[PDB]
Design a protein around this ligand. Structure first.
Ligand SMILES: Nc1nc2c(ncn2[C@@H]2O[C@@H]3COP(=O)(O)O[C@H]4[C@@H](O)[C@H](n5cnc6c(N)ncnc65)O[C@@H]4COP(=O)(O)O[C@H]3[C@H]2O)c(=O)[nH]1
Ligand SMILES: Nc1nc2c(ncn2[C@@H]2O[C@@H]3COP(=O)(O)O[C@H]4[C@@H](O)[C@H](n5cnc6c(N)ncnc65)O[C@@H]4COP(=O)(O)O[C@H]3[C@H]2O)c(=O)[nH]1
Ligand SMILES: Nc1nc2c(ncn2[C@@H]2O[C@@H]3COP(=O)(O)O[C@H]4[C@@H](O)[C@H](n5cnc6c(N)ncnc65)O[C@@H]4COP(=O)(O)O[C@H]3[C@H]2O)c(=O)[nH]1
Ligand SMILES: Nc1nc2c(ncn2[C@@H]2O[C@@H]3COP(=O)(O)O[C@H]4[C@@H](O)[C@H](n5cnc6c(N)ncnc65)O[C@@H]4COP(=O)(O)O[C@H]3[C@H]2O)c(=O)[nH]1
Ligand SMILES: [Cl-]
Lengths: 143, 135
């Protein structure tokens, strides 16, 4: 455990949720698969990788619903006809594992989580608001 | 800080919500159109009954192998909404709200009469903490 005066020398990677605990899907998976992963894991948005573990975007329940809401009914038969790549968000913030934690703190003001990558955009984890708030609450209650 | 939750909350007039007495088709429509992933459930006197969100809706119609969208108009918001939720008062110290958003993306705020007055969000907390940290 770090002391308060060390927290800003820390890196994103030291506090991220590591990739092997992160639910994610792939660019070529269909929306039925992505919706099932979102629903079973209980998350509203998760990262999207390719088969080489490169980070490409985010997919969420709201995006999927907006793709299948029809005029008169929910067109669920389209879920397995559409790929994640066609509807995912690609305009996403990114952190590097070696970025200073203060950069991560700033980015979660406007983002519930931020994806973390190594070199070459290889996915490494996510940097969440809960981790920031848990840590900052500890250090304010001590100070 | 010496400030209160009420000084930093998002006021109720800005808050998307679902009215009691509606079904999940309506709730899912409101969540989808507004883009919010979870929002308060209120009655017409603006008292707070629970929270409703897309994760709870999808899980409530998660069948054997598929999400059963056709059932949404058969299920009430009340049957699915989360009711075991924290609540803040407008004069609670801000540190109480800070602790409550560790595990909650937002916490509802009520007044003296238990009428809904706003939500205390992680963004407002993080915005103030960043300013206080950076100073
Ligand atoms: N009590 C409780 N709270 C939960 C649970 N799952 C999530 N939460 C809380 O809800 C917040 C919002 O979840 P989200 O699904 O809308 O956004 C989540 C989700 O989009 C993503 N995320 C978090 N952990 C993830 C993970 N392990 N894999 C994939 N995505 C993940 O990061 C966002 C922010 O996570 P967080 O931990 O800071 O805040 C959670 C967390 O505090 C849960 O099962 N129970
Ligand atoms: N809960 C909530 N938060 C919101 C809402 N609108 C904005 N926010 C939050 O405030 C930040 C600043 O919003 P802004 O309108 O002052 O600047 C916005 C705006 O200038 C632009 N932008 C974002 N989404 C846009 C969009 N959909 N269309 C056009 N411009 C958009 O990018 C800025 C940063 O957006 P962001 O999502 O990273 O951060 C938001 C976001 O975290 C909102 O309606 N609800
Ligand atoms: N605590 C608090 N601050 C507020 C509130 N309304 C406005 N503000 C402040 O005034 C600025 C301009 O508000 P706006 O409604 O004209 O644009 C807002 C609004 O359009 C949107 N937004 C942010 N959080 C939102 C939220 N939770 N719900 C809906 N819209 C939201 O983002 C814009 C920029 O937010 P900001 O926090 O950077 O600056 C706010 C913020 O500093 C409010 O209800 N509570
Ligand atoms: N640019 C932009 N950013 C947005 C918008 N809506 C949300 N955001 C951002 O995404 C975060 C997660 O939103 P959410 O819908 O998953 O959870 C939201 C939602 O569940 C709820 N919430 C926030 N503003 C609300 C509002 N005005 N009405 C109802 N519920 C609201 O509080 C959660 C945390 O809000 P926040 O402002 O700290 O973080 C937002 C905010 O930073 C939006 O319309 N535009
Ligand atoms: Cl959040």
């Amino acid at each position: 455990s770090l002391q308060s005066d060390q927290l800003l020398e820390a890196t994103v990677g030291q506090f991220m949720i590591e990739a092997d605990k992160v639910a994610h899907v792939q660019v070529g998976n269909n929306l039925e698969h992505a919706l099932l992963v979102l629903t079973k894991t209980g998350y509203t948005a998760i990262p999207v990788l390719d088969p080489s573990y490169r980070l490409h975007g985010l997919i969420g329940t709201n995006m999927i619903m907006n793709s299948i809401f029809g005029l008169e009914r929910i067109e669920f038969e389209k879920l397995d006809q559409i790929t994640v790549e066609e509807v995912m968000l690609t305009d996403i913030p990114r952190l590097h594992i070696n970025d200073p934690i203060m950069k991560g703190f700033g980015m979660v003001i406007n983002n519930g989580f931020v994806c973390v990558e190594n070199d070459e955009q290889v996915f490494e984890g996510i940097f969440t608001r809960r981790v920031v708030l848990k840590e900052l609450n500890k250090h304010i209650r001590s100070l």
